[PDB]
Amino acid sequence: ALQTIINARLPGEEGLWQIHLQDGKISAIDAQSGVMPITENSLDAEQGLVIPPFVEPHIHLDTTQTAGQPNWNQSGTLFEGIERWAERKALLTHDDVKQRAWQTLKWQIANGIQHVRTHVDVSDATLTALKAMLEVKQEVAPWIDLQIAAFPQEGILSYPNGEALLEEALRLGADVVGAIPHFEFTREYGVESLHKTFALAQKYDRLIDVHCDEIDDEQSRFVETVAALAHHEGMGARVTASHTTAMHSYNGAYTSRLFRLLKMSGINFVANPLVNIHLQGRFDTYPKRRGITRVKEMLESGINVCFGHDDVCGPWYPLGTANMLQVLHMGLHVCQLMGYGQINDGLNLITHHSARTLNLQDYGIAAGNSANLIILPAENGFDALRRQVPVRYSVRGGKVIASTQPAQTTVYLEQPEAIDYKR
Amino acid sequence: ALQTIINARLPGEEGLWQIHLQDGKISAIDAQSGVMPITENSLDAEQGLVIPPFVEPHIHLDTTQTAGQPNWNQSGTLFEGIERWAERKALLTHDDVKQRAWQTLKWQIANGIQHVRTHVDVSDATLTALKAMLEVKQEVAPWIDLQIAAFPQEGILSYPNGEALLEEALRLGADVVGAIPHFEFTREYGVESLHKTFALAQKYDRLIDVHCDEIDDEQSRFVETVAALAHHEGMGARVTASHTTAMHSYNGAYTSRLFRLLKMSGINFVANPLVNIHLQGRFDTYPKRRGITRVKEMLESGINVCFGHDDVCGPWYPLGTANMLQVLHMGLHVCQLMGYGQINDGLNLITHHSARTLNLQDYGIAAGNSANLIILPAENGFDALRRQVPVRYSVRGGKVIASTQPAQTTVYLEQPEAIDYKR
Numbered sequence: 141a142l143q144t145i146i147n148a149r150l151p152g153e154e155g156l157w158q159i160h161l162q163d164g165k166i167s168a169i170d171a172q173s174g175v176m177p178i179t180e181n182s183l184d185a186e187q188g189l190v191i192p193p194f195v196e197p198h199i200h201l202d203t204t205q206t207a208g209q210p211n212w213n214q215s216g217t218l219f220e221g222i223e224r225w226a227e228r229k230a231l232l233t234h235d236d237v238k239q240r241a242w243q244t245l246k247w248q249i250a251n252g253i254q255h256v257r258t259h260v261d262v263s264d265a266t267l268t269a270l271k272a273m274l275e276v277k278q279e280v281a282p283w284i285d286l287q288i289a290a291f292p293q294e295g296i297l298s299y300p301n302g303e304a305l306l307e308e309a310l311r312l313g314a315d316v317v318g319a320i321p322h323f324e325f326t327r328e329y330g331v332e333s334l335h336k337t338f339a340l341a342q343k344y345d346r347l348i349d350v351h352c353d354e355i356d357d358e359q360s361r362f363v364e365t366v367a368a369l370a371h372h373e374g375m376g377a378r379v380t381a382s383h384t385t386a387m388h389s390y391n392g393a394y395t396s397r398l399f400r401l402l403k404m405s406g407i408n409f410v411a412n413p414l415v416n417i418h419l420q421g422r423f424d425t426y427p428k429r430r431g432i433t434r435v436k437e438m439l440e441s442g443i444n445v446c447f448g449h450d451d452v453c454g455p456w457y458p459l460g461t462a463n464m465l466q467v468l469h470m471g472l473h474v475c476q477l478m479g480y481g482q483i484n485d486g487l488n489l490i491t492h493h494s495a496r497t498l499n500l501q502d503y504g505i506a507a508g509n510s511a512n513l514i515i516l517p518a519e520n521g522f523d524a525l526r527r528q529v530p531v532r533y534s535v536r537g538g539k540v541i542a543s544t545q546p547a548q549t550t551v552y553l554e555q556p557e558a559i560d561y562k563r
Numbered sequence: 564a565l566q567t568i569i570n571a572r573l574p575g576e577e578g579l580w581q582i583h584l585q586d587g588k589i590s591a592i593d594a595q596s597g598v599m600p601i602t603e604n605s606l607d608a609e610q611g612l613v614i615p616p617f618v619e620p621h622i623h624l625d626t627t628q629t630a631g632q633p634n635w636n637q638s639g640t641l642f643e644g645i646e647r648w649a650e651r652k653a654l655l656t657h658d659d660v661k662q663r664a665w666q667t668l669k670w671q672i673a674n675g676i677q678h679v680r681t682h683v684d685v686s687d688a689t690l691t692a693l694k695a696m697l698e699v700k701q702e703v704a705p706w707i708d709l710q711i712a713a714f715p716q717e718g719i720l721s722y723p724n725g726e727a728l729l730e731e732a733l734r735l736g737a738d739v740v741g742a743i744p745h746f747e748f749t750r751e752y753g754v755e756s757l758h759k760t761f762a763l764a765q766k767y768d769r770l771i772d773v774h775c776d777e778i779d780d781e782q783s784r785f786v787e788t789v790a791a792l793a794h795h796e797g798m799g800a801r802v803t804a805s806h807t808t809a810m811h812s813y814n815g816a817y818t819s820r821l822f823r824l825l826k827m828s829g830i831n832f833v834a835n836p837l838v839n840i841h842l843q844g845r846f847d848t849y850p851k852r853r854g855i856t857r858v859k860e861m862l863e864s865g866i867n868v869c870f871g872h873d874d875v876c877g878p879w880y881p882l883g884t885a886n887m888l889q890v891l892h893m894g895l896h897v898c899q900l901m902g903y904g905q906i907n908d909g910l911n912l913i914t915h916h917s918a919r920t921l922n923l924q925d926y927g928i929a930a931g932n933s934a935n936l937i938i939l940p941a942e943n944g945f946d947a948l949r950r951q952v953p954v955r956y957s958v959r960g961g962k963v964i965a966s967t968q969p970a971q972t973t974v975y976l977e978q979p980e981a982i983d984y985k986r
């Protein structure tokens with residue numbers, strides 16, 4: 141089957157491009173001087189944008205599809221969400237977890253997402269969801285490379301056998317070590333928990349992704365320990381701080397001091413715009429803070445930052461179709477990244493930057509890489525974002541794994557007219 | 564003598580009740596269907612409210628009755644108060660302490676208080692006040708069960724031989740181990756001081772009551788260490804955090820996170836409304852914060868909180884008659900617990916909740932308990948509070964130990980009329 145992608149636009153490049161495929165890899169990328177004809181074994185991008193696959197750097201596949209079960213959250217807070225989740229966690233079964241994880245994973249495949257990092261709550265002696273997710277990881281592997289992050293949701297030091305269970309999760313095969321220092325009983329447990337997390341990541345050679353300062357508390361500064369420990373161990377690339385919503389509330393002087401360390405450390409940041417706008421600012425009356433981390437500033441400083449969906453129809457977020465362009469849309473608005481170039485470059489926040497966060501080794505439209513790429517029916521990132529386009533084709537190992545025939549809208553004026561909303 | 568209390572109202576109960584007494588204990592409690600006749604050996608509550616005795620969970624009997632000696636405070640701050648007290652402490656004698664402690668204790672007996680926890684400053688190599696108070700404890704025992712809390716007023720780590728003196732105080736018989744982490748030179752001394760306090764309480768099997776975050780500093784969070792250490796040691800019931808006025812100034816997000824630990828830990832909280840309204844907010848100009856801990860929220864969350872008088876005519880508070888209904892009145896206003904039910908249930912804050920704070924084993928109107936109870940000439944808690952009623956009778960071991968013949972007010976209109984201010 142497929143030998144070429146033709147008539148492709150590429151972000152930050154002029155003109156049209158031909159992507160040659162061989163043995164499941166990209167063999168060569170060649171500029172075109174005009175439109176190429178279609179032929180058998182050519183997939184025509186039709187002057188749409190070709191990008192490496194969307195990435196979901198932060199989702200909770202063990203909580204997905206449980207919104208309102210057994211009860212709703214309600215106050216719309218992180219803290220009530222954890223309480224509601226704890227009630228649902230007591231009701232987990234193996235098949236329950238696999239079915240719900242797979243439901244969301246199919247939406248993700250449909251949405252051109254080929255790389256997903258799922259957190260899985262390991263504050264659970266039975267490790268029910270983890271055992272299920274390890275099977276799901278193997279099952280979905282033809283379509284999605286799933287990383288599993290062992291997430292000690294109720295604390296490492298603040299939950300019975302929390303450290304032991306976290307380590308057990310790694311011994312069972314979790315790819316990433318998690319932590320939640322702002323949810324530990326004390327600041328000292330918070331800091332200690334990070335030492336323990338880093339020690340485990342080094343013992344097992346695993347990545348780190350900390351739920352870090354997800355709280356509107358200007359004194360929640362666990363991020364400095366995450367970055368300092370990464371710098372000390374020389375392991376920045378392998379380390380991620382998720383959320384860091386407290387950073388929205390820091391004074392500017394501390395933030396400036398901190399940013400030097402953040403860039404030196406080389407650690408990654410995940411913002412979760414759909415969830416953060418909902419859960420943050422809940423303790424303000426009016427005015428009410430936005431509560432997303434300092435994405436615009438990170439980008440300006442060359443600090444790697446990217447966007448996750450976080451929860452899809454779960455205890456913290458009742459909405460979602462696991463759509464990364466939608467996540468991006470919310471983040472651009474709330475972060476005021478609304479300049480033409482900022483919007484256009486927005487795709488990086490859900491592609492390349494997220495690949496870096498996942499420490500991916502085979503990602504991007506480049507000769508020698510696996511032929512994993514998606515085609516958006518749009519002229520550039522700005523257009524894709526504005527029109528919230530579907531993924532026309534998703535290609536993995538040089539084979540089509542998803543396609544969307546786009547909607548067709550007609551208005552019946554003096555004559556019928558097709559409406560495509562371009563611009 | 565006394566065999567029965569008749570015509571008694573009880574909080575949260577309908578109708579009238581008869582309380583049978585035998586051998587200094589309550590033998591039985593029986594509902595009445597109407598008013599019972601008086602007889603010899605019956606004490607007639609006269610459809611007034613019968614409750615277990617008032618409790619003073621936080622007072623400084625070593626500083627009581629010293630207001631303005633040798634100098635006044637003045638700025639009306641915690642910090643100047645400590646300075647003024649230090650000057651008075653240098654002048655203490657054995658008999659001086661006993662006489663002043665006894666003066667306030669008699670006001671307390673008159674006010675139906677049968678349980679008192681006094682702090683005693685043990686930042687004093689001579690332990691003068693402690694030695695006096697240990698004698699007072701034995702002397703007053705027929706009327707008041709006095710707990711002595713060893714209070715390292717000038718710090719454990721920040722005062723010469725502070726830890727040794729604290730331990731000496733326990734060896735001499737103090738019932739409760741104190742601490743003052745926000746007054747230690749550094750945050751690290753604050754945290755360390757709490758480890759040392761818990762270690763002493765476990766070594767000697769004593770209760771803990773920390774002067775905790777009594778400061779308008781949003782960064783004073785020693786309460787999380789007090790609660791975490793209690794939870795770790797499984798000793799919540801035995802532990803109290805006094806004041807926690809900093810909590811008035813916390814952001815809502817941290818407070819929400821903290822509250823989960825506060826409820827899990829099971830520790831007790833004392834607010835001191837008369838003193839807190841006076842000493843807190845002194846560093847604000849306008850607007851000026853109230854500075855009482857989050858009493859309303861604690862009650863809503865089922866966290867045990869109660870009220871103390873703190874200082875009676877002392878270096879921090881020049882007023883007082885050691886009257887718990889007056890303390891309660893101030894707290895209801897400043898905390899905005901002003902709903903009918905909130906006011907009516909206010910008695911719990913100076914009875915049952917305070918008994919829990921003192922870890923009392925024989926408290927409440929229940930069969931088998933000691934016959935320790937007081938009678939208020941009021942229909943319910945709301946009425947008692949509104950009219951600031953005296954204690955008509957105080958009964959201990961089934962014997963009357965105090966009584967008040969109430970004031971009689973007459974207005975001379977066209978005819979004389981008795982005025983009772985009911986409603």
Ligand SMILES: [Fe+3]
Binds near residue numbers: 198259450
């Ligand atoms: Fe998450």
Ligand SMILES: [Fe+3]
Binds near residue numbers: 621
């Ligand atoms: Fe005090």
